[PDB]
Each structure stands twice: as structure tokens, then as C-alpha cells.
């Protein structure tokens, strides 16, 4: 910055925290459905995309 009149540098360090959950209480639920077929292969299904 001392050595450049028409270009400047900047530097900054910032923290963050972020709360984990739906803020609507009832949304915090999840289901899954699992089948094992007779060859032993497994098909998993769950509510997420």
C-alpha cells in the first residue's frame, strides 16, 4: 500500500457460527424405508432429496 498509489491491498479475518435445525420445531423429523431383497442387495429410501 505504501508502494502503490492506484492499487491497494486489503486483508480481513472473520469468524462465523450458524445454528443447526429448522426454526419451526415440527420440521425437525425424518423418515426412511429400507428393503433387503433376497440376493442381499439393499434399497434405501429416505425423505431427503
Amino acid at each position: 500500500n505504501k508502494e502503490n498509489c492506484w492499487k491497494k491491498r486489503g486483508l480481513c479475518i472473520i469468524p462465523t457460527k450458524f445454528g443447526i435445525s429448522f426454526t419451526v420445531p415440527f420440521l425437525n423429523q425424518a423418515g426412511a424405508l429400507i428393503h433387503v431383497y433376497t440376493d442381499g442387495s439393499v434399497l434405501v429410501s429416505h425423505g431427503g432429496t
Binding site: 502503490n4 498509489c5 492506484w6 492499487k7
Partner: protein
């Protein structure tokens, strides 16, 4: 520096993460950097949207 044409500095990327415990089963992939299961089909144009 005002007279200088834009110049690319070369990239440097470092990723640091934790190894899984030494004797964890090879079949237990939790904690391992397993690629997205569909990435190969995405790269091939086979993944269906």
C-alpha cells in the same frame, strides 16, 4: 502499477482434513473422501434430470 495489464498469478490449493483411524475397516467408508455416487454418470451425461 496503473499501467500494468492484468496478470494471472499461479494457483495454489491446499486441503487439510483428518485421516480415519488406522485400523478402520476398508468397507467402513464413513470419514473417507468417497466421490459423489453419481459423479461418473454426471460426467458422462447419463445422469437423468
Amino acid at each position: 502499477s496503473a499501467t500494468l495489464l492484468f496478470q494471472k498469478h499461479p494457483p495454489a490449493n491446499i486441503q487439510l482434513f483428518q485421516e480415519v483411524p488406522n485400523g478402520q475397516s476398508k468397507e467402513d467408508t464413513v470419514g473417507r473422501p468417497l466421490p459423489h455416487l453419481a459423479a461418473a454418470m454426471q460426467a458422462s451425461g447419463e445422469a437423468v434430470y
